[model samples]
Target: DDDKMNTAIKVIHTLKAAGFEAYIVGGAVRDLLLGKTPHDVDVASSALPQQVKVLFDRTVDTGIDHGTVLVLLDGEGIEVTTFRTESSYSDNSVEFVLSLEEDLRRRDFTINAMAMTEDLKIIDPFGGKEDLKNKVIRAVGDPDERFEEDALRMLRAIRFSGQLDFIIDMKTLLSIRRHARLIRFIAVERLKSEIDKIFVNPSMQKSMAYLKDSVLTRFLPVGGLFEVDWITYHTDGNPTYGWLYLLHQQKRQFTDIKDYRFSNEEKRLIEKSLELTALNTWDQWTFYKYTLKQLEMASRVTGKKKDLAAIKRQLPIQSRSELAVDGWDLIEWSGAKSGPWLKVWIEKIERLIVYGILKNDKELIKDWFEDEY
Candidate 1:
């Protein structure tokens, strides 16, 4: 896996050849230290934004003002950002920093403040290795200042604990409580993204409990997130399902699904899952409304897996298209016009076939209609 990412290593070497210092940095290094394969790697370099552009064959100014350039290598995007001091940093540059230690110092937590050299050596100036050993998430410097610098970091700290199953440093946890309301300043869309990260973690119970005690829910668009079954909620990795499960036990909708800015499909899935959870029994009719996979998800939420199997065994027909008679056939048999009565008659025929009271045969249906009506 590491060998496949040799392009990144080559990029770093290319930067070094140009008399610029570059290293794979941030969450990538943290994950590597934890013996996990990071999904992506970021490179921080001493080269200026323009200098970085000169070295790369194909570069896009993804965040040029913030000292970032997307380096296209081997047809893959690699983000390379220039380093800058705090005084030289702008609103756009706050996320980037000059020098390895300064970059590490400005980081939100110790574990994420380290860097990795092209030689695969870790540069840990902030005791990130020690913190990792202790299984703790400690802030780089003053927790308050970090939280003040980026309010979203508070949620990130919680998310990291959930993901890594590490304990938040007491000081850092306390600072989070102090600045909990600052989450209100963050975008709900961004907040939702972070919540999705936390919700997917299997051991998120403690982090979730801290979120409740922090009283941070008051600022979120969705309140009452603290009340949930973490086990059942974590059953599936879908954030919509997780959110719906969190609010499933409540009598009312915790908040409008629109507030979380879920995609139309995601919102619809949650809605359909909620609708299915309320069913007294799973019949062929109800099972036809959703797929077997969807029914399993609903069964998880409702603890009704038995009904899930029952529906498959008793499904009358796969769907309405499989019905032997159509509306035209019914109209021809009953001598009825295309009116509400036609719809009602078709439904009756569908029910009769579904319940095994009558066969889905054209002649049998015509004879039955004549005998009944």
Candidate 2:
């Protein structure tokens, strides 16, 4: 992690040597202050995109139009963005600025608005350090204006609170509630991204309470129906579990969550989990049908302690393909025409095999079949 900081500082030094001011900025500064390594380091500089491109031997035009360039150093890519201020939400335009203070002031939250120089000298004009010390999430300046510029910032506040386990400032909380309805204007995908982050946080219950209080849930897709009951809701760092828990709380089907796009895989997992949770007791066939992950999620949702592993191991066959006899074999043995009865007989045999009542052996099943017919 020190190496990461060193490389970022090197970039700052390079920018400074080129007669441009640069500092480590945004979440990296916040994470450093919290004594945690940041996922990535971003450097804000007075150097324009072309200036930054000229200074770095290996540079990628990653969002260059937005005043960002990816500077490759020591096998790591650091995002070096020029100091810029964005216009209001009406135009969504960005203008490059010369001062770091102006750029930092344009950020969303105080904690994420600080900057760090090459010498590690903190540059906090918005009392960000103080807010961090108190473990609070406060907007940079006017909460109303900040949220008005970008409604996603409202959800981001909740996300940061959940991630840091920090409380939102009273004023900021009120602003979020007032501007919560504006969140509908933001894209659903962006909303889902923030909500997913919030759901996976260990302090989800705290954040969720804020979500309800701020009235943001009222505007989310199917969010009004959700019951954020922490006592029954469980999270395993998997967003799917969180969604399943919420759906289970409302007794709502997956189809009810309209406009919020879930990947096909997530849909399958959630649907299967709902199915398993609806069952009072999982039969042998149930163990064979659902994957272990689905079973675990369902068990957590229902708070039922089932020896999933043991039941899975006891199953004679995991899938129908694993059955010793297929429909072809059954038809040949029965001397019966192939029809729906073949499928019925095969499933009956599958269930019997799953329950350990019938051994999965073709000859043994043939003898048993003769007696049954």
Candidate 3:
């Protein structure tokens, strides 16, 4: 691990020696500053797109227009961004600006505003080190002003707090609460990435605490968006068409997904909670028929104190996949062609198996399908 780390460090050093001001920056810097091993080695440079491209024999222009180029070394993809400034912000994000400081200045939070070189010379432009040392998530400049510049940063404040288990500075915390609503103006894709990060934090998490106090989900409701109207129509005596459709989104995001964790057990709990929540309105038959997978997810998500204490323990086996009657069996038993009517015989056995009427007995199963057809 140390060897891999040093190899990447040497690569950055090589870039700097080639007359480009290069350093490990962004999340890499933030993680190192926190005494953690940085995962991705991102290098920021003083060179422009074509210059950086020209310097590196093997390079990929991933986002050269916005001053980003991928320096490929031995099949490794290292992101190397230039230190040019940003321009505008009709929206909160950096639409355009000038200079590295202006680009970093327009950043959301003070702690995130810091940068570093290959040798770890700190760039404390916004007193980001003080905020880092203070264990507080604060905006780069004034709270409201920073949020006004970029609203998604409001959620990022809480996300980073949950991410690092830090406290938001008093004014910064208040500003997040005050400016939380502006998130509606932010792009959904950016918000999703932030929320996904928060969902995977360790220790006594701060996700639910931040969202509830800040009323964060007002921008995106998981399941409750129905009161307004999404898209609804039902062919059967079931709300599965509407409810399940929305639930697909809810389960994807896990809806107002407050209780979070980095553990597999926690992930199971989350998925199961959604499944159990579905059972509140959906009938057992409909729920079973619609999803064997969801029921399994449900069994995991809403687990009890004891293994035997769970609803799974009480749920009798749902199906006899070992049915003695197949379409072939039904055709042999009854004077029937293997056509659409064959489905009726299969359905009859399926219903019987689901309701626990017959086990996998060939004679009994054949008689049941024949009688039905």
Candidate 4:
């Protein structure tokens, strides 16, 4: 982690050498103070985009429109964004400022607005260090104006609250409630990303309470009907489990799954989980049809304890291919033309094998089939 900070310092030094004011900024600074290593190190500078390109030998135009440049240093890519402030949220126009304070002021929260110099001095004009020390999430400036500029900041507040296990300042919390409806203007993808972060965090219950109390859930997809307190449930840090539990609690149908814009795979998992939860009892066939992970997720959603290991051990075959016979074997033995009956027979055989009703022996199965016919 020190290596990452060093790389960011090198970038800052290069910018400073070119007579540009630069500093390690945002979450990296916050994480460093918290005794945690930041996943990504960001740098903010007074240098313009073109000037940043001139200073760095190797750079990528990553978010260049937002005054960001990705600088490659010692095989590490550090994002260096220029000090800038937004002019209009609708047009997304930004004015590159000449001071670090202006840049930090435009940020979402105080904890994320601090910048660090190469000499390790923190530039916290917004008292971000104080907020961090107190374990609080406060908007950088006027909470109403901050959220009005970008409503997604509302969810970000909740996300950061969950991520850091910090309390939202009363003023910020009230501002979020006043502007909760503005969250609807934000894109669903952005909302999902923030909600996903909150769901995965260890302090999700804390975030969930804020989500409901702030009235932000009303603007979220299916959030209006999601009244279940997460304190009563345990999540495995997979948002899928939370969604499955939410759907199950609300008795919502699978067709209502479209409200969240989940990925195809997520939709499938939720659908299958709900199906498994609805079952009165799972047989060996259920164990064979679904994966252990899916069954575990469903079990968690249903608040049911399943002896998955014992069930797996009791299964005669894990998959249909493990059967000693195939459709061809059945055709050859019976001398019957294949049709829908082939699928029916295959499933029947798979269930029999799964239930230990019959052994996976080709010869024995042929004799059993003859007797059934």
Best by TM-score: 4
Model 4: per-residue lDDT, tens digit, 105-218? 888999999999999998899999999999999998899989988988988998898889899999999999999988777777888788777777878888888889989978
lDDT-wise, the better of 2 and 3 is 2
In model 4, the Cα lDDT at residue 133 comes to 98
Task: Kindly report which residue stretches of model 3 are placed more than 4 angstroms away from their true locations once superposed.
Answer: 1-7, 85-99, 203-205, 215-293, 305-333, 337-341, 351-368, 371-373
lDDT of 2 by residue, 1-373 (tens): 6677788999999999989999999999999999999888999999999999999999999699899999999878889999998755632278998898989887999999999988889999999999999999999999998898888999999899989989999999999999888887888888889988988886888888888888988987777755457765657889888888888888888998757899999999999999988888778778898998899888888887878888787778878778999888889888988999988888888888888998999988888777786
RMSD of each: 3.6, 2.6, 8.4, 2.3
Candidate 4, overall lDDT?
A: 0.85
TM-score of each: 0.85, 0.90, 0.70, 0.91
lDDT of each: 0.77, 0.87, 0.61, 0.85
Q: Model 1 over residues 37-74: C-alpha lDDT tens digits? A: 77777888988888988898899996888788888888
> What does the lDDT come to for candidate 3?
0.61
Worst 10 residues of 4 by lDDT: 86-95
Model 2: lDDT equals 0.87
Name the runs in model 2 displaced over 4 angstroms.
Answer: 57-60, 87-92, 330-342, 365-373
Q: Which stretches of candidate 1 lie over 4 Å from their true place?
A: 48-54, 57-66, 74-76, 84-98, 229-234, 254-258, 307-314, 330-342, 356-373
lDDT of 3 at 99: 49
Candidate 3 lDDT over 43-96, as tens digits, reads: 767767687777678888868877788877755667777775443364641233
Count clashing residue pairs in model 4. Answer: 0
